[PDB]
Amino acid sequence: EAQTVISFHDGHTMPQIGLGVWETPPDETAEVVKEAVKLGYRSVDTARLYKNEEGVGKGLEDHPEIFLTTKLWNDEQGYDSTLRAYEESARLLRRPVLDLYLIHWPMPAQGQYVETWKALVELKKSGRVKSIGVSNFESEHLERIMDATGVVPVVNQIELHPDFQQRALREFHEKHNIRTESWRPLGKGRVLSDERIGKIAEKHSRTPAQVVIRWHLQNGLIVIPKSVNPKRLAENLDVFGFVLDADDMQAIEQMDRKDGRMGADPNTAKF
Length: 271
Description:
globular, 10 helices, AKR5C2, alpha/beta, oxidoreductase, eight-stranded parallel sheet, 10 strands
């Protein structure tokens, strides 16, 4: 049973499951990363927001194979300011050339996300980063940066889980060959005790989390769950030895709620 990967339109390839090092203190981040690389994680995802890029970079010291993503935080948006921020991140992460760089939030009220994207375009062209994408962009924000540059992000990383399945945004993503990456894949844990999920989990001799991760996978989605517990890390990774059937997939499809969003709305988010 091999892990799966997802390929971008730009010809690059990313592991389909990664580690979201979001809630890890800077101090024990190196150690969490070394542990997950040991368990078999091939993709690590962080952000300037979490302030632990130095820890990630140390933890991946002798592991340049691990796919590495980081994001530009809101207050560093702007053309020159993104180019600096990217460089700084590259140094903190001890990787001269990053595998993926994302705009963390569009923040439409700032007026800066198009110029930020043009900085990312330039980072791709100059060869400073392999792939460029976005996080938390609505179709409209995507339309805008595509119209301004002619350059499509390879990935849009968005809140996505059984309660909020983001179908219309994924329809839009499809048309432009944009991969979907789910953050909040487990819905802050709400799903871990769902009966509908629980029955599917019994049927497959797997756990609720594993059923849910598999569901992301079978939908073609890049999935970065987070976990402190290396017991849950090993669990989350052990998802390539079963298959959800058509009944399973439809039953989860049916969980989608209009008020399923748990985190910030891209259009009204204010930090």
